[PDB]
Amino acid sequence: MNIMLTLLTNVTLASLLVLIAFWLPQLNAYSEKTSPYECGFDPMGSARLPFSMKFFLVAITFLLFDLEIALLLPLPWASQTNNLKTMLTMALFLLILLAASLAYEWTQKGLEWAE
Amino acid sequence: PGIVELPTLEDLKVQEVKVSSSVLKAAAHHYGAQCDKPNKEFMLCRWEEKDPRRCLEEGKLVNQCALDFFRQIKRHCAEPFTEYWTCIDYSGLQLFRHCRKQQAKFDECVLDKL
Amino acid sequence: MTMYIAFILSTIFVIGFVGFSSKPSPIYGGLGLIVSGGVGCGIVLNFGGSFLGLMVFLIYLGGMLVVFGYTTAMATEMYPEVWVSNKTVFGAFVSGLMMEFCMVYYALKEEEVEIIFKFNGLGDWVIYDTGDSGFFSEEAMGIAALYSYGTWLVIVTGWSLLIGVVVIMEITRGN
Amino acid sequence: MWFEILPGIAVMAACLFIPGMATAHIHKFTNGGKEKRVAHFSYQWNLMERDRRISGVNRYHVTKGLENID
Amino acid sequence: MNPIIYTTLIMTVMSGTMLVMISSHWLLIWIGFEMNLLAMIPVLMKNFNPRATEAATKYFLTQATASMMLMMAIIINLLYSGQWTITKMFNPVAMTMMTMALAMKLGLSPFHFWVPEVTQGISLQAGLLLLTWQKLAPLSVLCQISQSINPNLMLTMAMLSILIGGWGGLNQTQLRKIMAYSSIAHMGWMTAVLPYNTTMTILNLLIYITMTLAMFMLLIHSSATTTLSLSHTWNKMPVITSLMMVTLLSMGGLPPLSGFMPKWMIIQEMTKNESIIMPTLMAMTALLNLYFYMRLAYSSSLTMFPSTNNMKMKWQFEHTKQMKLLPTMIVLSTLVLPMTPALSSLN
Amino acid sequence: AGRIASFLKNAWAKEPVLVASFAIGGLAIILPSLSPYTNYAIRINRATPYNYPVPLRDDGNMPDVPSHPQDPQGPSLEWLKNL
Amino acid sequence: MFMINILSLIIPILLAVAFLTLVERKVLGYMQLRKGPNVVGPYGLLQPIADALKLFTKEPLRPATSSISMFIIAPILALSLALTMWVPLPMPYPLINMNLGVLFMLAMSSLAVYSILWSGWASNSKYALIGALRAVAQTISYEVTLAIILLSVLLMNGSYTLSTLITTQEHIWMIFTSWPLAMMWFISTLAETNRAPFDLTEGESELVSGFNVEYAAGPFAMFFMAEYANIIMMNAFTAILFLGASHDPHTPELYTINFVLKTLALTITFLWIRASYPRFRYDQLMHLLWKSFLPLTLALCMWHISLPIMTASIPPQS
Amino acid sequence: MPLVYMNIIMAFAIALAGLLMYRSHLMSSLLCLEGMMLSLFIMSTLIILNTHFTLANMMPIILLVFAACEAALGLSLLVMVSNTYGTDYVQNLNLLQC
Amino acid sequence: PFFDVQKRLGLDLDRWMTIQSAEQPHKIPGRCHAFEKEWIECAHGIGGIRAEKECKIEFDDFVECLLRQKTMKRLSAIKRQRDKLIKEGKYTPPPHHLGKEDPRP
Ligand SMILES: CCCCCCCCCCCCCCCCC[C@@H](O)O[C@H](CO[C@H](O)CCCCCCCCCCCCCCC)COP(=O)(O)OCC[N+](C)(C)C
Ligand SMILES: CCCCCCCCCCCCCCCCC[C@@H](O)O[C@H](CO[C@H](O)CCCCCCCCCCCCCCC)COP(=O)(O)OCC[N+](C)(C)C
Numbered sequence A: 001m002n003i004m005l006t007l008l009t010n011v012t013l014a015s016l017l018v019l020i021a022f023w024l025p026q027l028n029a030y031s032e033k034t035s036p037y038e039c040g041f042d043p044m045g046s047a048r049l050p051f052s053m054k055f056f057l058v059a060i061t062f063l064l065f066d067l068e069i070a071l072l073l074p075l076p077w078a079s080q081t082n083n084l085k086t087m088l089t090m091a092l093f094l095l096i097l098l099a100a101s102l103a104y105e106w107t108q109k110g111l112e113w114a115e
Numbered sequence B: 001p002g003i004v005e006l007p008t009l010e011d012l013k014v015q016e017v018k019v020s021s022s023v024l025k026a027a028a029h030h031y032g033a034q035c036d037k038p039n040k041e042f043m044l045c046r047w048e049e050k051d052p053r054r055c056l057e058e059g060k061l062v063n064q065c066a067l068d069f070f071r072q073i074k075r076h077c078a079e080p081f082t083e084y085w086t087c088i089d090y091s092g093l094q095l096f097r098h099c100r101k102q103q104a105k106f107d108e109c110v111l112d113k114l
Numbered sequence C: 001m002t003m004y005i006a007f008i009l010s011t012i013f014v015i016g017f018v019g020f021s022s023k024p025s026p027i028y029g030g031l032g033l034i035v036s037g038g039v040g041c042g043i044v045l046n047f048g049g050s051f052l053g054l055m056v057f058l059i060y061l062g063g064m065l066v067v068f069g070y071t072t073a074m075a076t077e078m079y080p081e082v083w084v085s086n087k088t089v090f091g092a093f094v095s096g097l098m099m100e101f102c103m104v105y106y107a108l109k110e111e112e113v114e115i116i117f118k119f120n121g122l123g124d125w126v127i128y129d130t131g132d133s134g135f136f137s138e139e140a141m142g143i144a145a146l147y148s149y150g151t152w153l154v155i156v157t158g159w160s161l162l163i164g165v166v167v168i169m170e171i172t173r174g175n
Numbered sequence D: 001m002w003f004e005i006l007p008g009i010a011v012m013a014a015c016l017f018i019p020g021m022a023t024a025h026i027h028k029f030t031n032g033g034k035e036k037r038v039a040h041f042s043y044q045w046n047l048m049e050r051d052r053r054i055s056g057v058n059r060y061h062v063t064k065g066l067e068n069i070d
Numbered sequence E: 001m002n003p004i005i006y007t008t009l010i011m012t013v014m015s016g017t018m019l020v021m022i023s024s025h026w027l028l029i030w031i032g033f034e035m036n037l038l039a040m041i042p043v044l045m046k047n048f049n050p051r052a053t054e055a056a057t058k059y060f061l062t063q064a065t066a067s068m069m070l071m072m073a074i075i076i077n078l079l080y081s082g083q084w085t086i087t088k089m090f091n092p093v094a095m096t097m098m099t100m101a102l103a104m105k106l107g108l109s110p111f112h113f114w115v116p117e118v119t120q121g122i123s124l125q126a127g128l129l130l131l132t133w134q135k136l137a138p139l140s141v142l143c144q145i146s147q148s149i150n151p152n153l154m155l156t157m158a159m160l161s162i163l164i165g166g167w168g169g170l171n172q173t174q175l176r177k178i179m180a181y182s183s184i185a186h187m188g189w190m191t192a193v194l195p196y197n198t199t200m201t202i203l204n205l206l207i208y209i210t211m212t213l214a215m216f217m218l219l220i221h222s223s224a225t226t227t228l229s230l231s232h233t234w235n236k237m238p239v240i241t242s243l244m245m246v247t248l249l250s251m252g253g254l255p256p257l258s259g260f261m262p263k264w265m266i267i268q269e270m271t272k273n274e275s276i277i278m279p280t281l282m283a284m285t286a287l288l289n290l291y292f293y294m295r296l297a298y299s300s301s302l303t304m305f306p307s308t309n310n311m312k313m314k315w316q317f318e319h320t321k322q323m324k325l326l327p328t329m330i331v332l333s334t335l336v337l338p339m340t341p342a343l344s345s346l347n
Numbered sequence F: 001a002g003r004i005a006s007f008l009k010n011a012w013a014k015e016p017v018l019v020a021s022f023a024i025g026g027l028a029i030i031l032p033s034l035s036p037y038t039n040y041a042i043r044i045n046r047a048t049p050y051n052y053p054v055p056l057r058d059d060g061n062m063p064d065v066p067s068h069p070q071d072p073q074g075p076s077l078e079w080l081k082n083l
Numbered sequence G: 001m002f003m004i005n006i007l008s009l010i011i012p013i014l015l016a017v018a019f020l021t022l023v024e025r026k027v028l029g030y031m032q033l034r035k036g037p038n039v040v041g042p043y044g045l046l047q048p049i050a051d052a053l054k055l056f057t058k059e060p061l062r063p064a065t066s067s068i069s070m071f072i073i074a075p076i077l078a079l080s081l082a083l084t085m086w087v088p089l090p091m092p093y094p095l096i097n098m099n100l101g102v103l104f105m106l107a108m109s110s111l112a113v114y115s116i117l118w119s120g121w122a123s124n125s126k127y128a129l130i131g132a133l134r135a136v137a138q139t140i141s142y143e144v145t146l147a148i149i150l151l152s153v154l155l156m157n158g159s160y161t162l163s164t165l166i167t168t169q170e171h172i173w174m175i176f177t178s179w180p181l182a183m184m185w186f187i188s189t190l191a192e193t194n195r196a197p198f199d200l201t202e203g204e205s206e207l208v209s210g211f212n213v214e215y216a217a218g219p220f221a222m223f224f225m226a227e228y229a230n231i232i233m234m235n236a237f238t239a240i241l242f243l244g245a246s247h248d249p250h251t252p253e254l255y256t257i258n259f260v261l262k263t264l265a266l267t268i269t270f271l272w273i274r275a276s277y278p279r280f281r282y283d284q285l286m287h288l289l290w291k292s293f294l295p296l297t298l299a300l301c302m303w304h305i306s307l308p309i310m311t312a313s314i315p316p317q318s
Numbered sequence H: 001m002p003l004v005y006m007n008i009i010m011a012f013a014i015a016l017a018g019l020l021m022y023r024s025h026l027m028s029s030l031l032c033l034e035g036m037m038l039s040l041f042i043m044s045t046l047i048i049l050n051t052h053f054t055l056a057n058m059m060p061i062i063l064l065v066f067a068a069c070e071a072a073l074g075l076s077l078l079v080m081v082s083n084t085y086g087t088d089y090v091q092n093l094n095l096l097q098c
Numbered sequence I: 001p002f003f004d005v006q007k008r009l010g011l012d013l014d015r016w017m018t019i020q021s022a023e024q025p026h027k028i029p030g031r032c033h034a035f036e037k038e039w040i041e042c043a044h045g046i047g048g049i050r051a052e053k054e055c056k057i058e059f060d061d062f063v064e065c066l067l068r069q070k071t072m073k074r075l076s077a078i079k080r081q082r083d084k085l086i087k088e089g090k091y092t093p094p095p096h097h098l099g100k101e102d103p104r105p
């Protein structure tokens, strides 16, 4: 209940700042002023053209390594179990495979950007 | 499928314990030391019957024993106990460790009087 | 009855699903999926699943950032489409909105078996349990049980993650 | 100076003092002056609800001692 | 691909299938399917080309949709009963989702469209794997939940699979598409008897797998993927063509060959349940599969097609790599009819 | 002997980060199996009373079960006080 | 009365950001043998007010090629999330007491990047697109290492509750137990707030203005306020996480003062770092995070899982 | 049932229809797959929380992990398709027929 | 199809997670623990075909606990009658059902 009110207040303040910024000052908009900026000149092509990503392989690995965090964040609660040997074995086992997955992609030139 | 039987409102009446959570927490250790037998009997009834309607008299005995315990505390020294539970009540987590002097004084009072 | 907050959150969930299912430009699709993830996090929070809702929000934020990067890399067009820039996308969006409206109306104003079974509404508060005990969160205990009860699950999950890394590297090799 | 940077730092420190002090003062003002109760678990919430019920004025922070057991 | 990586991926596919086999929990079966698909996708792309990429993409889309439907059905079943065990689903809607999901995984009609294209787009080894090993897990799941299936939907899908397999195979000149349509028809035959006797399904699975393994190995040995390319094998390896012709006759279900026994047992088992019309239609439709098998046998072994001059150079070279199990698979695909009563060991 | 010594010298010269990471990981893997306090951690986890201790119905044949919390029978946490 | 507390939180934060701009200008001036703003008011105390009034009385412009809805939404999201990041911080009492405050801050921080991404894309300009892609790269670089560092540090706390960190550090600062993790966390927060030497998204020398190049006037000012508020919030979070101030339940103002001085010192440390170093290349940042920070982070995660078990020092409150 | 259950089920149905109906971009369909997974996560979490089945609180996490595996697989395939054709359109994938 | 390696080796790979009445951490019970316990013990060892018929009562109780359809129907009927009675003024709610009750611990 309180968090919804806080979020509403923050969003309302930001929107009101936008409204003040957009309705208080004098506006003189013409085509030259609103045109796209490339430091002195008209752009050759469109900004919506395909923009190559040279780190595309690391981007896919980030997806798999981000879910490693989901499996590891309950660890503080897992340390309170009675069978500490089993939990420690499985926690260490999970990180070892994460370390081995990083080592595999490193040694097979997966961390280097496309040329 | 059958009619559910319920106790009448008269049978559910008891002399209620109207002290706050801070007072209960301050007294809890000695309360569990002194009123162990009726509480344990009530819990045994509770986990054996698996029905709240079958352990009403045990609950009333629990209330009576708690009232007797608090009456003894009030009769013998209410001032150290009041200081202790006020100190406990100030804390937002009601932590024991922040009140050791008041807890001590209450402890010597109960140990010497009772 | 009581403030129907979860009803509004689930309606916004369905609205975002319609938004990214009408399939505008993947930028707006990812925006709709982010909105859906946030409102689903709120829904799960309203039933006591703080960890699960927050975790799914975090995971989908990371996934949608990767998806935005990939959309700019390989899924662009000269004029990216919005929900009102195309007859097909707008028609799909309106059809989804009105289908959800019809389902909701027929659900709360009378009792009908839509596809599986029927329901009257009454809000979510009715089906609760009013259980009163504990110095812990049962969700947290159940999730932490993965490292003591779910050894088999941890093994298969770790193997699948390592194999997934190997698989993406095998696929993106080329030649 | 180098000590002319200090007035801005002091103003920023005064601004940063306000949130925590105001939060503490508001908690005390709205919780009987005794450090607003923390309910991280259901047992603490049960204690708070029982405290509200037995207060007689529908306020959990109104504490009844041994004077309420006749 | 590094040979170690290929071995790891094949072992991961097999381990996912075995996880589906040995699990009592629906989540573990879903996990097995996910692991199987994850390790399977690279194997289709081992020889890189746009056709292999397209086949892998279509396969991934189809199997991911089937997995989503699978999980949704599992969740419905959990909702209407707090059960995770795979014994018998408690909701008809969840069971319909489960059936549609497993049929899409198997490639039953009208979810058959992906099978011929994916089979054509990959190599012969990947085709062998896809058409033999990938059927075990969904069929095992269907066997475990047999008492819950709706006979009408299952039998409709089976009859459609048989009809569409025959009709599609009638029109093919590429050998991989012929094998894919044959696989669709055989899957229809297998799923026709599942609501009545799972032992018959297992027997049909074993015989179909044996025949398909023998046929794919014979196609690898004579490295041909089209009808006209296989037409040249007589001028280099007549024994291979003769064995191919006999195996094709066995696949058509002609007595006294092995391929006849599963159809015979399925027909008699269905007649035990007062089902007469549908087995009759099933055999009359498998006549089409026999027809295009006979066309392939005409073009491959029973007549001699013209050859090229460069075959003389091939005459001087033997096969460097030999397949160890090809001889056994041919014998089991042809000469096992007298050993029929051994099917009691399958139950 | 000398081959591994030269390999470790080269690794320390070129990749001290990886050397430190492997050393810390190996220590974290092996040290817990040799520690005498792991059992103390297990016992501390076991000694935390999360739920209510349900009493047993006395039948006259439980000499090792207390009839009151302050009775000498039952587990003792004296080891924890001095730890 | 709760809205009073919300305002007493948000408004002083905005004032602190406004004067942090002046503190930055003066500190970087004095490290560069000059003075910085000292004319607009005594010691330049009126400079932030003049800057804000000039910015909000200037004309905002919509680019002709821009996508209007996302263009307007992005600064709103940035400023609102920057304000929202402060509600679970215990100073020593939080406005919103959460069981999982750290992970909530993680999720909100992860969501904050989309303001930069969407502003860069909706500007429909090449430099803004380059800035947005650099932001994607930066998040991919730092996210996993930052989260695992939080996990390893909080393993000694016993929960994800921010107020428990005060109790955990009643006798000693957590830094004396996890200083390598503290250094890596400090660098990760430098990268997370797009601050030098990791100020890649704006990239002023290389990309002119980067993601916010199209923005002018009031909308531009909100991006600036969001960035500076995020800097202050991150430094305050670091102070709570690694420098535990002693809290007296009967005198919380002492804790508040100690907290404020520590977070001011950390903010000045950021300012010093900006004044001291050149800029990374944005592939070098990812190589640093994935080849040096990630292995040590994994090893120290293993070590911090094993250590409480080895020494029988597991914290309470499952 | 609660009406939230119907809302989540219709979210799943809408995402499934969105996947089954294809526009030009391959990426849009991957988003529909992710949406189906999100709806499955929400529904399973609600069912598990309502019935207080403690041990399956970890099951949605496994669901999320295999969702990430699926998304990585789809993105890799999209990379290869776009490298082949310079575009992620589905109509370019027509070399193989029935 | 189903090779029961777990039963042959006594491994318990995933059987700990199949049912709601099976050894939850900290002995936290399921909301329908007793109904499922009764239904499982009714149907044990008699086969699936008989379990459906001779144990339909226990399964019906378990499903009612799970989804609470009949309870919601009864509550809806009671509240509809209550609203109908108030709208004509024949019935008045008691003070303890209007927010003026005397609370008890
Ligand atoms: C810091 C956070 C808190 C902020 C609190 C203040 C929030 C302010 C929000 C922004 C509003 C203030 C902006 C400046 C004043 C408003 C002026 C403008 O926005 O309104 C005009 C509204 O004009 C309307 O188009 C027509 C006027 C008549 C409208 C009739 C509505 C009903 C009136 C009925 C008359 C009888 C009385 C009814 C009211 C009681 C349109 O202005 P326009 O010229 O485009 O813009 C140029 C701006 N300049 C000139 C100041 C530079
Ligand atoms: C027959 C051939 C065997 C070898 C090949 C098999 C291939 C599969 C991989 C391994 C088989 C899985 C068997 C392990 C099942 C886990 C359950 C069993 O081991 O007991 C656990 C014992 O824990 C053990 O430590 C299991 C961990 C050992 C496995 C980790 C490394 C081995 C995996 C290697 C293959 C995985 C992929 C490749 C990685 C290199 C838990 O017992 P405990 O906690 O007391 O009590 C639980 C009951 N409670 C909850 C009420 C308290």
Ligand SMILES: CCCCCCCC/C=C\CCCCCCCC(=O)O[C@H](COC(=O)CCCCCCC/C=C/CCCCCCCC)COP(=O)(O)OCCN
Pocket (backbone or CB within 6 Å): A096, A099, A100, A102, A103, A106, A107, F008, F011, F014, F015, F018, F019, F020, F021, F022, F023, F024, F025, F026, F029, G291, G295, G296, G298, G299
């Ligand atoms: C048993 C512990 C296991 C668990 C703990 C480890 C957890 C995290 C650590 C593992 C993370 C993965 C690291 C993967 C290593 C990749 C190696 C590699 O290929 O990098 C080489 C460089 O690294 C090498 O030199 C190859 C290996 C060298 C040895 C590395 C450490 C091996 C073990 C050393 C210490 C052993 C244990 C400590 C004992 C200390 C002695 C008392 C290439 O460098 P580039 O960045 O590409 O160059 C670009 C600019 N030229």
